[PDB]
Subunit: 241 residues, 4 copies
Amino acid sequence: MTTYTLVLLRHGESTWNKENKFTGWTDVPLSEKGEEEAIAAGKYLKEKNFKFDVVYTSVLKRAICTAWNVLKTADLLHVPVVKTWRLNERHYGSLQGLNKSETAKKYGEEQVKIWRRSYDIPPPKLDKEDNRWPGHNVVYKNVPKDALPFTECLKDTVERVLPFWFDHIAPDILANKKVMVAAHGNSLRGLVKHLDNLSEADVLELNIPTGVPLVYELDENLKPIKHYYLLDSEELKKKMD
Amino acid sequence: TTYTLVLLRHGESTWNKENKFTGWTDVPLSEKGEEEAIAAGKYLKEKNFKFDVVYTSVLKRAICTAWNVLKTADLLHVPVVKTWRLNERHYGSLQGLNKSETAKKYGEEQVKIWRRSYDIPPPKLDKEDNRWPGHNVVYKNVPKDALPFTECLKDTVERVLPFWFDHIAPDILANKKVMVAAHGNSLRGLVKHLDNLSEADVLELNIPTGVPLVYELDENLKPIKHYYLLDSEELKKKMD
Amino acid sequence: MTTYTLVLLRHGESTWNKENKFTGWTDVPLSEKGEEEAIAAGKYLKEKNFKFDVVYTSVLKRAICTAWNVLKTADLLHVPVVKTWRLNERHYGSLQGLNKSETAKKYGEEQVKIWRRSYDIPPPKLDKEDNRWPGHNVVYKNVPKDALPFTECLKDTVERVLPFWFDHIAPDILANKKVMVAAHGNSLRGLVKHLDNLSEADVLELNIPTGVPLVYELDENLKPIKHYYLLDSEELKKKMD
Amino acid sequence: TTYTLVLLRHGESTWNKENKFTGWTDVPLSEKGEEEAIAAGKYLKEKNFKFDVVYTSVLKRAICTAWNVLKTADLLHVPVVKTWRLNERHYGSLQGLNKSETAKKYGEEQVKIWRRSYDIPPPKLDKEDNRWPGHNVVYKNVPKDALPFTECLKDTVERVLPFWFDHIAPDILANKKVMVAAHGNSLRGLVKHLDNLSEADVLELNIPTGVPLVYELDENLKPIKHYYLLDSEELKKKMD
């Protein structure tokens, strides 16, 4: 008898995408193009008449600008925005800032694949005393420093995402408010893993395109009914890589 | 003692050019207003001002000012909390009307009263007026009977102070750095409290746009002093 | 088509009621009898099947024990409780702690009546440096000291109550949750003044008995439909003084 | 450095006398449990311990302990925040059963495992069991799929730590005085973190009932030390 609507939105391209450095929690801005992706997304949302009561996002700039550009375009600047580290990209450990190929040559090309493409084998942990430690960064000034990863594997990311869904995202949906989550591909993958109740296998085969709204239709027990991408079926096919 | 409070008043909207009275009319920042917010931001950064929280109204000429400052200072991660209690002072039947049509309706004399008094609101709207804030989904979560049909500066001060007491001040008291990016009239409500000003002093005070106003406060939130964080003379030329 | 239910509950007798001192914000406990009043109220609520999602109360002990005894009796100890100075008794100024008759003889017997029974003429203001100033009292450690009265008249009490209704009590009711307000007669009178939209006149003629639940039935715009006391019509008649 | 954290574990319930495993079964404090909460309170007062906030579970043997302490210390005005994340560790199919009927069903050997391991939960309930927490209106605001069918100490630790990170610890970090009045297993989850304990050390540790456990912490929330705020020998006699 009753249906809920949730919107997941990955962030568009960033400065590092055309550079091949591992990024993780490194705070890179959107690029000209990823700015265009969030306005467009917003434009589509407006045209199809999606309204929001809450927007949840990471504390990483590239997702915050995404949420913001959507709301501006859709004329919902008044909508409250909740930012949480719990929505961040998967942390890349000592790999952060480092060049993908130059690390495929300072280690096996099969080592970087496990670290990149597996589910539960994390890259080398950072030291606390390294300057990339999140705990040195004022962004996390107001968060117990022991909550912050030295390194993550997708399973760690999922585990730190799900509390935020049960405590905040999910009550909201259950309270009859329309929520959008503008986060990162890995954190959004933690979210669909649970929603679609995916095995380790399938969730690793799942690729979420950038800048494309993912609409989930959920029942009274928040189990999906269906899920669809809001795009024209010519950009979507292109956008699927 | 610490506690540094900064107040930022938004730059002009698109309607300043058209001389249309705005009030709660949710009009966007003009391209000039926008740039002022960025200057303010370039200036806060250059003195190493940080914030743990931002407070703002629900009208977008105010929220973009917040945004621009945080983008410019590289503080995008900071919480932003938007309340109707920080809204511009409501402008009753004047909303949407330009100075001209306003003179033609009420005469230039009545309008000076509604623009210059503390006490005497402009003509009031009612529930058969599509400007009534109760019709505006932006407020679908406020008991409609909390929402103004019109306002004078006093009304504006009265609804702003609860938000000062319930949220702004307790944050300052926890050791938090807060910026309040809002509107002339809502900001003057804060000041009238902070500086213990009379009805008469609150009227003499204009707050320039795009200039951070910094308050240093003692452990009881009484100002030690306050200053505009801008150039010695550009500060005077901006008060116009 | 849709109806809301709000429960206002005054607190039962206190130690000072059988002493004749002006009490105001003075933190006196319930008496044996007022403890009995809150359990009974709770008992009636349980028997008639009233459930709560939130309880709002003052920060004065005598109302807190009331809320608590109701919830215990009604088996709702898990229900969150929000305590606010904004729900306090009307502040009695320099009168606090002082004896009603001994102040009818240190001043006109018509002066104490205006101070007691009028709407907008407050008793003499306390000094900050007096030990009765609320701002010295840790109960208010976490509240800007400039929010706290030196003295109140009912109009002041109403004015400081209504923000709490618009910000917190009212959204809750509007959100489909069942609320009880366990506060004080003067603060509850601020609340019905607004609900029934009473003149100054009528609200001053209004006497709320202690320990008796006051049920308001409200429509989609939170305007009352009806309001009734949950008691047997033999105690109620007795209890009306 | 400051930060004084106090942990208080509730006294016995009415079911300790009946030897019935409780878990999430919402059973009241025994008259003895009640009195322990008051002693704890008389002791906190006598050393002038204050709190700005109280954290507790949603089960009433824990909330009354909070209450009693605050009544005894004359701190009734203090906020009390009740979360399912601080609930006793769930006891699966054992809930409602006494030691006897438990031996008759599973044998005394399996039960020691479920009482003594870190890793191996008791037999799990399902949605056709009226003990399932999802049926209990107490949780009508929690997505049911967050709610346990059974638990071992590890499960209990895993769901308690988010509440430590999202609420308890940031309060300590703002300069707030917090007491956590809860259950043995939920409290041991806190300690396992605070003292950096292994799976093996967390098992050796019993927390006595009705004795405030005080932690002094450094600016990073690492303990400097911790002590039981009770009598030199009565402390040993209570560990039994």
